[PDB]
Write a protein that binds this ligand. Sequence first.
Ligand SMILES: *[C@@H]1O[C@H](CO)[C@@H](O[C@@H]2O[C@H](CO)[C@@H](O[C@@H]3O[C@H](CO[C@H]4O[C@H](CO)[C@@H](O)[C@H](O)[C@@H]4O)[C@@H](O)[C@H](O[C@H]4O[C@H](CO)[C@@H](O)[C@H](O)[C@@H]4O[C@H]4O[C@H](CO)[C@@H](O)[C@H](O)[C@@H]4O)[C@@H]3O)[C@H](O)[C@H]2NC(C)=O)[C@H](O)[C@H]1NC(C)=O
Ligand SMILES: *[C@H]1O[C@H](CO)[C@@H](O)[C@H](O)[C@H]1O
Length: 356
Amino acid sequence: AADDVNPDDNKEDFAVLCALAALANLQTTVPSIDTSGLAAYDNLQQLNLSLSSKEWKSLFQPPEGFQSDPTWRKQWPIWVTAAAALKAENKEAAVLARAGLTNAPEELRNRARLALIPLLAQAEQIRDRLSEIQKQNEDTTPTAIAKALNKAVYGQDKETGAVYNSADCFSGNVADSTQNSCKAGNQASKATTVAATIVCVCHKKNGGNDAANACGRLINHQSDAGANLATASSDFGDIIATCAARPPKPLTAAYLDSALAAVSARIRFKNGNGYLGKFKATGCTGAASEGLCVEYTALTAATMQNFYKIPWVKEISNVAEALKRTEKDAAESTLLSTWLKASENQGNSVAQKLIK
Ligand SMILES: *[C@@H]1O[C@H](CO)[C@@H](O[C@@H]2O[C@H](CO)[C@@H](O[C@@H]3O[C@H](CO[C@H]4O[C@H](CO)[C@@H](O)[C@H](O)[C@@H]4O)[C@@H](O)[C@H](O[C@H]4O[C@H](CO)[C@@H](O)[C@H](O)[C@@H]4O[C@H]4O[C@H](CO)[C@@H](O)[C@H](O)[C@@H]4O)[C@@H]3O)[C@H](O)[C@H]2NC(C)=O)[C@H](O)[C@H]1NC(C)=O
Ligand SMILES: *[C@H]1O[C@H](CO)[C@@H](O)[C@H](O)[C@H]1O
């Protein structure tokens, strides 16, 4: 009976699946876009406006004659924000004091503003890139990642409180038979979550002839999954009780990518299908003489791309791609914000040069 599904026969598959199931109800930090440079640029805009003429200040859509000017259309929101911030009690005085322009003569105020022209031109592109980064990664959040991962593991699009529920773990709930429930990738795809995969790879069917403890001898199968997974929830609770995996914190794209690669390296192809978990004959029925597995119907090495279209695989891939971008953009934003704060310091120094 060595070719039958015996206890611990799916033990190593289960280790990988436990690592994936630990992505549920995840509370992770994400790489932060350092946007402190945006405030430094706003401070530079406020200095510039503070040093501007009464005619220019009185302007605060652009006025008639500049409504279609592309620079005014671009800058208007930035200028408006600077003007609004400067209206705050004592704000302008602080701006001018930080720049050494308190009670500055009119000639100095003018020369200082003009000296900011190339400074602001240099900072504009840096600030615009930082703002673009902020917008591009604004949906890479702990909440959105947790929801996507809970969709992957439990089929429940929620940030927390995700739990096993066959109605969500199997697409449209369990099928008429275990064999049909434990299929993914085909038209009638059912095992579309990590939890459904664990059920299919580890469950103890009722009726005898089961493969209890296939995923580990320390599982206490106190009940069973019923006939044709009708009561898989109780049995899943016992299986998952043995899993204590913890992903690295913060969660990284490299970790997720390696987890998915590991699964892909364990799927085995036979008779025109792919299988995760031990398969002997007929189907992934839960019977020890047939299989305790997911059948990736019609999956082949040449169609492996279709594995990555299975909902749980796609959800985790989406999270990994998003984190991949945000990791790089976060590292970029750190330098952009440092340069902008440096530009602010430079602008606060021009008065001392012009005076001397
Ligand atoms: C720091 O704060 C200062 C204010 O103290 C602010 O300066 C102002 O910047 C804007 C945007 O660059 C300047 O807008 C230009 O305005 C002139 C007309 O100037 C008159 O009217 C304004 C408004 O009343 C007065 O402030 C000014 O003193 C004058 O009386 C326009 O002619 C400019 O248009 C050119 O650039 C546009 C950019 O898109 C083009 O679309 C436009 O067609 C013009 O270029 C085109 O034609 C050119 C030939 O004329 C040609 O050379 C080009 O290649 C192209 O074909 C522009 O709208 C405004 O004048 C500035 N005001 C002062 C007092 O300096 C700074 O913007 C602010 N710094 C930052 C970083 O925000
Ligand atoms: C299922 O059938 C196999 C032989 O094909 C046997 O080893 C098992 O004991 C039975 O449950």
